[PDB]
Design a binder for this molecule. Structure first.
Ligand SMILES: CC(=O)c1nc(NC(=O)[C@@H](C)N)sc1-c1cccc(O)c1
Ligand SMILES: CC(=O)c1nc(NC(=O)[C@@H](C)N)sc1-c1cccc(O)c1
Length: 130
């Protein structure tokens, strides 16, 4: 219905705003673009489903997220990929892990404070009806 499409458009506006605030944070620069094989050759060996903040923006605009839960699954994938690719005690690994945990925590904290629970419930109920 037209009212349901208005609901999903508001969700997209919200998700673009959250994603933009993550992408401009200097701590999260490493998560802003897809990993380039020429700069990180062994990445494809470890990471089966790559994800980054530019890919998240593309998915918003392709109407792939109908709930904030679906969006947070991709934020969580950005973080879990970073933890999997950076498991060692070396400081380069530990720095990326710290930033990945901060990305996850920051996204969840923004959503917990700024997303109305009834709005998310409406999105989920529309999704379950389709
Ligand atoms: C995001 C990620 O998992 C990632 N991990 C690294 N780990 C390392 O360099 C070594 C120290 N474990 S570099 C890196 C990365 C990826 C894209 C751009 C960029 O500037 C950095
Ligand atoms: C989208 C969702 O299912 C969701 N997941 C959370 N994760 C947690 O509580 C744990 C995993 N940190 S908080 C949260 C949430 C946040 C705001 C409004 C709302 O209705 C739900």
């Amino acid at each position: 219905s037209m009212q349901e499409e208005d609901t999903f458009r508001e969700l997209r506006i919200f998700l673009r705003n959250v994603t933009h605030r993550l992408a401009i944070d200097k701590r999260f620069r490493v998560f802003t673009k897809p990993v380039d094989p020429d700069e990180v050759p062994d990445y494809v060996t470890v990471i089966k489903q790559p994800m980054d903040l530019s890919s998240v923006i593309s998915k918003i605009d392709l109407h792939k997220y109908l709930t904030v839960k679906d969006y947070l699954r991709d934020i969580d994938l950005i973080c879990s990929n970073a933890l999997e690719y950076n498991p060692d005690r070396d400081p380069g690994d530990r720095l990326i892990r710290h930033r990945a945990c901060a990305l996850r925590d920051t996204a969840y904290a923004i959503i917990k404070e700024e997303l109305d629970e009834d709005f998310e419930q409406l999105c989920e109920e529309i999704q379950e009806s389709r």
